[PDB]
């Protein structure tokens, strides 16, 4: 590759070696395990580059990583792409067969795997080909990664190449029969970091990330590049703390002792942290957790707001950067009380810089943003995956009509706020309208003797797909289906026949199938019940 | 596509419409079901082309087929490639998960499936994407294929395109963790037909296929294009009989009544046909079955020769055309008695026209053809798959050193005869030599109280991989491991320590794992026992 | 040239070193002169390659050959093309001026010429340029070719190149004012060999070439690559005998002593062999001569059939491979008596594999194959010359309408049999119909006092071109033109005015002009008489 120095390429090496702020004394902390300055971080990155070069990794090669959140993952986030190789992030929460399929599909050359992830490999070891070396990662000095790093020198001349070379890749289950692989380039990652920093960094007084913060992820970090946060924090040169195993008590201790101010987690982890007895006497009025997993509930937002936590939501769908929208509060919205606060903070949010985000039905129409007309979200951003890896027809459906299809049905307010109502496949197509099953699930969950509710659709000649409810009862709770029918019929304000209460067809089931991540298997319930 | 008429392209349409001999009165017979002349066959091919065009199949599309041997499969062998689409042959003997993986990998658009293969689809129906239409095939008039054909006209202008467009594809399990997809072009198929017709058609008086024969396959016909035989017979314009379900009594009745003279099957089916009571009073002295499945045994060849059957072996490995070598007997070899006949007819054979077939060790050396020096077979033929579909590193190992690697270890006689001794992965690497486990399996199977034997290797510091035997005993047979050790030690004439009898390590196991095809799972036994 | 080993090229070296059968003990025999095994043949081919390399012959060079049928011509058929050079076959039966024109047009670099062809060169020696070396060939040890071969080693690495490189070329007089040069590639020759072997090798019991035959050409072998037979026999590894001078007694002795079973000759040579006194006590019931020169007569076929000779006809026109059609007899046609045998064996035949062979008038229409509608034969085959060398407008007329024009007018039966009736230029265009002069020549030759007859056309205002007969009388035979007119008028069953007997215009001429090959100079008779 030959490049004229006038022509500038957006590379991750520019993100690391030309940050907004660089403090050599700033420290990266791995929880109760290790602590080293930014200068040591740069030296270790160069050592890792030398070690990867020594093992035969080249520009076209792929390196797979399988561990928790640590300094090693942060070093892999940089060193591998800067060599030019591909960083394959493996979802350790998938089934061993799916993990093996992803490894075979991506054709990884070297695998770095944590010690306590070894049994998962042990049952798919012989099935794996195309892999030459396994590096075992440990939390003590007997780590193979540490022994590999301590042999190399801290001197590397990082090459310059085209900004469109692929840097990272990972696989998402989605709704297809096999996991789909998404990929991004150096330019896309750099632009995502810059745009999100411009969006959330310029807010007046709420939900802003600045150079005085202390960062600590609470998301798995093999999903969606941990929302791009580790790239951003390194760009700001802020203190970074990595917890590892995600134990609520260790997390609370790290927040108290390291003075963490910025984080991102999911509603389940936030609820566990808030309900922990250790947290009842902990100061929380400096913390700005970002909830992005799925559908931050209003009650959880209220409970966090009563603890003086700047909690706000964001949207990302694992092939869109991921960040597309974040709730931002104008100064006259900060003076509202906790109910109006929790109303706004639980929304999907306004689109971030350089995002279009139209609402569109089938045949691509541009339904207005009145605030109640729902439709599928289609976006155009500088950091979208062009297609699926080694796929043709799903790639065509992904970019149908010239826009990326999110698969989420939402309505957009006149002021720009987005409120996601359901998923495209989960919409019940009664007659000629489209009701969202989420509000029926919420209504049925309001019952005192109901634990979990799943709503699906079953064919019906005159009224299309009609709804069906599977409910799980509580301890020593036995309410007949007629009682639940009356409970749902009690509510008002909905369309269709009367209030669409003649076809609820609620049934009581002991258990509801869930994915390996922990999400209801609506497809399967469809297979089981129809 | 624009072509100068002077420039000639080798296409399957030339194979069908410009045969060696064309008799409109010659008939194709589907067993006790249907019987129609060659003119009707051409009309049905044109009707199928029109029907496929009507459903939206185009040049780049793929059509999958799942049924037994019938006129419909013969029509699919032609019509789909002549449109320019890809014919994906699905192995119905694989597990449903493997079948689903192959369907997802090949991205089939339309699936033609037999009725009694429906349950297999029923458990993978929802997992399947990228498929638009399913056509159910039946043996009566309610077949969807027949109803689709009877609407179209018998008039089609078949296009002309580049001879390098892919025509057929199918998947082989091999030794990898996932099935590997191989593909061939129109030119390769035409050249394979022409070369094999030139090779076996020009023999003096034994094992020759000519225009007066009657053809009937006994191989699954989704493997290896049924050895290319259906293409060849259609080229010769000979009578063709398709049995379907492969029931030994129906097969014998078809051979008796249709006067079948040429066939290809596997040793198991041949043994079942020979041992059937119905066959004890059947005339067999016009039949020229070709055995190509795997390792035709000498005893079976003798038993068939005592029934006046011209039985001979052929070699094909599912990515080599498949035909690479066929045994051909010189006129002074026909005067030998049954023992010398069965010696020669059970060999791998001499290479067919336009085949190189060298013997080669690691680092690619060209060990001489002395008759006892074993090595891996590497070939160069006009009908080899260039690589594996959507694969990189296995493709590199397939064509390592500039030759296609068969994976079979054999020795070549000075006269050109090849004798396959084992598989590359199944070789036991004791010390510095390579013993073949097949002869030890044969020796141990010679015991009176032994049913089946599997030989594997287990590590040993001073002598590399050493052999281990897993044996299954007969009804009320109990012989200790020491007795089998002495039985193996009784024989002579082998190298290594004494006769390599200090490490046999024979063990008795109730059952031995087998593939879905019925072959021992040596990899698994390795996983289970070590 | 760089080639990926996966990409296979069809080369003559593959035809020689990868045959159907290779027997090192099989011998090539030059009549009463030399006899050497196939291993010696391969060694001599390598030696000739080394010798040609030593003289400066390169890929683009051309080597001309001028001799009879011998081992040297067979070695030139292989060695020259395998180097990549062009083999120019010179017709030694042409006039010295035509030979000189062909040499100048083809620009030969080295000329190999037999001793007794030296006088022909002596009168055109000074006129020749662009030629650097002359190699004199002799039948004794003083041959320059033998002395050149005995210096080189038997070791050559034959290169691999594109399959579309030109291999052979030769010149045909045709109907143009100067000889026209045709050329073929390696791929075309290999495909011709494979296709004809597939066509004639797969016949049931008549007219088949197999690996147990003994081959001996009786055609000049500088015409039409000797019908491709020497390439085919070498591919089958059969014994080959080369007679040389074509003396009938030497030919009969070779057939008797070498046990020749397959041959190809012309009707004149066959008649000379059958009428020889030596042949009256010779066994002929193993011989399968192929007649392909021109228009095998029915009487000669009957006479050969009474001698128990499997005599059959073939069609080739010197720019079509040459083989296009061969008569093949179905098993129920072998049971007919000698008259019906001679009827079928004298026909042009059915088209061989991969040949289209439509019948077409001017403006390219596709007149039906009823069996009596005549038209010009146009073909599409994998082994047709794209054009004439260094020619433009004749090349356009050769491939007019997208098909190669044979120049022969024939009718095709409903069963596929072709019967050539005349040449396009020799058709008499009376009024609005086209009569063939061949049947009038046959009718007039039936007279008892007639030796030879030539029919031409002369203008006539109201009836287009009308026929004219030039006849030669026998010894002391004097029949007036009126007697011949009445003799022709006696016959019946023809169209046009009455029986087209009012314009015969028969004339008696002492001699009729003939080409240097021995064919009537109809153009010249047109020039002389009109």
Residue numbers in the entry:
A (entry chain C), B (entry chain B), C (entry chain A): 4 to 533
Publication text:
The acyl-ACP synthetase (termed AasS) of the zoonotic pathogen Vibrio harveyi recycles exogenous fatty acid (eFA), bypassing the requirement of type II fatty acid synthesis (FAS II), a druggable pathway. Very recently, the AasS (533 aa) of V. harveyi was found to feature a large domain at N-terminus (termed AasS_N) that is connected with a compact C-terminal domain by a flexible linker. As expected, a hexamer ring-like overall structure was invariantly formed in all the three types of AasS particles, regardless of a cofactor/inhibitor. Obviously, the pattern of AasS oligomerization is recognized as a trimer of dimers, which mainly relies on two interfaces constituted by the AasS_N domain.
We solved two high-resolution cryo-EM structures of AasS liganded with C10-AMS inhibitor (2.33 Å) and C10-AMP intermediate (2.19 Å) in addition to its apo form (2.53 Å). In addition to the two controls we introduced, (i) AasS alone and (ii) its complex with C10-AMP adenylate, we focused on the complex of AasS liganded with C10-AMS inhibitor. Unlike the two controls that are characterized with a dimension of ‘140x150x80 Å’, the inhibitor-bound AasS architecture is relatively compact, because that its dimension is only confined to ‘130x140x65 Å’. As for apo AasS, its AasS_C domain colored pink, appears in an ‘open’ orientation. Presumably, the AasS monomer adopts an ‘open’ conformation to accept the sequential entry of various substrates ranging from decanoic acid, ATP, to holo-ACP. In brief, the pitcher-like AasS_N domain consists of three β-sheets flanked by α-helices, and provides a centrally-localized cavity for substrate entry. Whereas, the small cap-like AasS_C domain contains one two-stranded and one three-stranded β-sheets surrounded by three α-helices, hovering on top of the AasS_N active sites.
